[PDB]
């Protein structure tokens, strides 16, 4: 534990925290979703509740170290509060997202960070037709709240949502689930905006 | 990165925080709304729930810098906790407002700040007649809680609520949505009080 | 800005915070209610929900200053957390009160403080008869939780609750609303206790 | 206020906080309940909600002073965060307890502390028979979560629950309410455990 | 009080907090569940709510002392905030866990820690058949959120859940409850992953 304490002190206590990305030093965040359950549909307010894991990854020069200088530590776990993290947010939630897991990240000696919060999210969806063979389609966009594509770029590893852990006995079965990078341009500004579109088709039985 | 780190230290770590405006140093806050959805109407209690983005802009001389002195940085993002923010509040909410987005501001080198919190708001409105073709009109005033017009002035860029992001499968159809600056006068004191009246006429799908 | 920052620095950063009143240096807190809406009535549990502004005023010697020494500043606004506040409490709530407004107060150069929190309160009341013409009466007492009348006295400026802001389209119509200072003797204790009794008579409109 | 400021500084800003009791230096906490209302009875989940004031009293040598040294001050009010407090817990709650009063205590010159949190508690009870002339009996135990009776001894001043403030128009009549110190033997541990059994008999209307 | 104050200062105020385990300095956490009550069952969302006490035990060399040096103190109670605690998490919750007990742990002179948070948990569970003689079986896995079996190994003293405290009058009767260590291996990586599977069979009473 002596070496890890030294490393953390060197990384965190010995310099001002990373002030986030800028156009001159942009960063790429990879997003991936693991859908666990569709827990609730409300057809009187058009709200649907999902439970999922959101995998985020990024890399910072300021979090790099040489394992040989620290007893060959190649990675460590630490509170998310200890590091900068991206402001990735649902764009059409209807209630504050509910965090279901400890806020702890894994940092690797190449400066890469992996952070996987589990969340319950209520978002806007008209669920009518959910009780049919065809099912229904809902969508919610995820992206930075304040950084344009010039500061934060988003990427997915695959366009397919991970369904391997979807609750087998859910009230709702998943027909398809995709996660797709998009580039928007608002008629006010020249910079691109990026989001990842979570599109889920599902039905009752 | 080095220059941004130095700039924030100069802006935030060297002086005390802006103590807010006064009659001698008044401020103008620009407000605007982007209505995403009407998520609930409760006819038993006369409450209606909105989800919206709330644009706020103002400008502080104490947040100014010369880009040439800081590696040509022209603006930056920072936690809204790092800066003074106006106490803009709904005048007829029935529940604490729920914040749906990160609290992060954009600061520009001219001292301008832009802050766009997304919110779920419950407020007083009698929805009677919402299920007619003529619909129903509700209204909520927004303004400073403790500053009069001598200290904080309000403006809208436009009197038209931004509806271009309105949920396309909402239970409710928006007939009109305006945001209008108003000068109030309580028969207690001379100084004027300013508010922005959000007025929304809508009906069931 | 400079003068104000200097004033606050002098009032808040140079001496320990005011530790609250004692018998030898008692304080008077003036209370007043602006009733905005009766939002909910629950006959299953005998709970009624009110939304109101609670106006509080008191005066501290330690908050005085000479405007001439501070650029003619005669008053200022500041976070409620910067100052001592009375522990004024509803005595028969059934849920934690919910705060609907920013916790900011106005401080004046003679040491007077004005604080007006907006709140939603659930309290004990049997609504039986609310649907009639006579309506129903409910009452709730407000006062310090831990200070006796030897340390904090209360008073009202008028025993008439301010209804000039009551929601015109409430489900309930106010027939009467009074706020009355009471002096209580508790058999446990030789000190006088003071409360303000908010009595509201109302019916379905 | 000068004298009170000195006293708090001497009591609080000189030594570490009291680290809580040990077998070598045990502490006795006195508990007393004032039942204000049985708010809710859920027959579908067997949950009952009470509102009560839980009076806690204990005494510490480290909180003692001589009034002659501090301007005849014999007691003072202070934030509960300023002092050690016992971890008295309801043992079969089903939701986190909700605090309804300010977290402030009264400290007296003999080192005695009195802290009276008003709370709303949901707990496990089968309300079958509540709608009979005989009513139903429910019980809830209170005591330290982590201290044995070797470290914290509990007592009541009376076995009779204070019903003098019970809400006159509750949906429920109280047939009886008692609070009884129990010495408990757990087979895990040779040390005695102590709890206070709150037993309430009640019926509809 | 003096000796304990010394001990806490020596354990907590001299060195940095334990930074958590690593592959070189792994840690075993022992878990044991005491099931108090199955409180809710929702067949429209497939969620079930449990109240239980989760015993957690582990041992750090950095928490050891010689009782002879500290007045024979053999163990002490302290806020869970003063120490490192393992990130043990339910893998299929549908809402943030609710904490029902004080966050206070017991530390023993051999460096061992015992911490027993009482909690209400909502987790994914199809209750179909709960209203039958055979009842239904649900399960939820517990483990570290970010540590693999190389860093945190889990174990149970027994595979039988503690039922000695189950609410006698619950709406649901417990047919069986087991808690068993399991070793997973996720396709991506080679390190073992460890969880404790809590399996409850139950029926309406
Ligand atoms: C639904 O569409 C939007 C999606 C998103 C945003 C904003 C969107 O559209 C809006 C954009 C604006 C207000 C309200 C909006 O609803 C701000 C916009 C604007 C101004 C100055 C700028 O600086 C010079 C600037 O860049 C601006 O444009 C953006 C500001 C923030 C964001 C995007 C664009 C991120 C912002 N956030 C949550 C991410 C997703 C002044 C006023 N003006 C309205 C023109
Ligand atoms: C690791 O598990 C426990 C941890 C702790 C305790 C008890 C625990 O589990 C037990 C709980 C019980 C017996 C044996 C136990 O081993 C009592 C339990 C019970 C009854 C009545 C209650 O009131 C009407 C009640 O609240 C009960 O549950 C608790 C009682 C005390 C404590 C917790 C729960 C605190 C008690 N102690 C000091 C703190 C930590 C009667 C029937 N029943 C046996 C089911």
Coordinates of C-alpha atoms in Angstrom, one line a residue, chain A residues 21 26-33 54-58 84-91 140-159 179-184 192-198:
Chain A
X21 CA -10.5 19.8 -22.4
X26 CA -9.6 18.1 -27.2
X27 CA -10.4 14.6 -25.8
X28 CA -12.3 11.6 -27.0
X29 CA -14.7 9.8 -24.7
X30 CA -15.9 6.3 -25.6
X31 CA -19.4 5.5 -24.5
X32 CA -21.0 2.1 -24.2
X33 CA -24.3 0.9 -22.7
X54 CA -22.8 3.3 -18.8
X55 CA -19.2 2.5 -19.6
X56 CA -17.1 5.6 -20.1
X57 CA -13.5 5.7 -21.1
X58 CA -11.0 8.5 -21.8
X84 CA -11.9 15.0 -13.7
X85 CA -14.8 13.2 -15.3
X86 CA -16.8 14.2 -18.4
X87 CA -20.3 15.8 -18.1
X88 CA -22.0 13.1 -20.1
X89 CA -25.8 13.5 -19.8
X90 CA -29.2 12.3 -21.1
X91 CA -30.7 15.1 -23.1
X140 CA -32.6 9.1 -25.9
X141 CA -29.5 11.1 -26.8
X142 CA -26.4 11.2 -24.6
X143 CA -23.6 13.7 -24.9
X144 CA -21.6 16.4 -23.1
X145 CA -23.8 19.2 -21.6
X146 CA -21.4 22.0 -22.3
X147 CA -18.5 20.9 -24.5
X148 CA -19.0 21.0 -28.3
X149 CA -17.3 18.5 -30.7
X150 CA -14.2 20.7 -30.7
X151 CA -13.5 19.9 -27.1
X152 CA -15.1 16.5 -26.5
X153 CA -15.5 14.0 -29.3
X154 CA -17.6 10.9 -28.6
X155 CA -17.1 7.4 -29.9
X156 CA -18.7 4.0 -29.5
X157 CA -16.9 0.7 -29.7
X158 CA -19.9 -0.9 -31.3
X159 CA -23.3 0.3 -32.5
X179 CA -26.1 3.1 -29.7
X180 CA -25.1 5.5 -32.5
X181 CA -22.8 8.5 -32.7
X182 CA -24.3 11.5 -34.4
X183 CA -23.2 15.0 -35.4
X184 CA -25.5 17.9 -35.2
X192 CA -20.2 20.5 -34.4
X193 CA -22.1 18.9 -31.5
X194 CA -21.9 15.2 -30.9
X195 CA -24.2 12.8 -29.1
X196 CA -24.8 9.0 -28.9
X197 CA -28.4 8.0 -29.7
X198 CA -29.7 5.2 -27.6

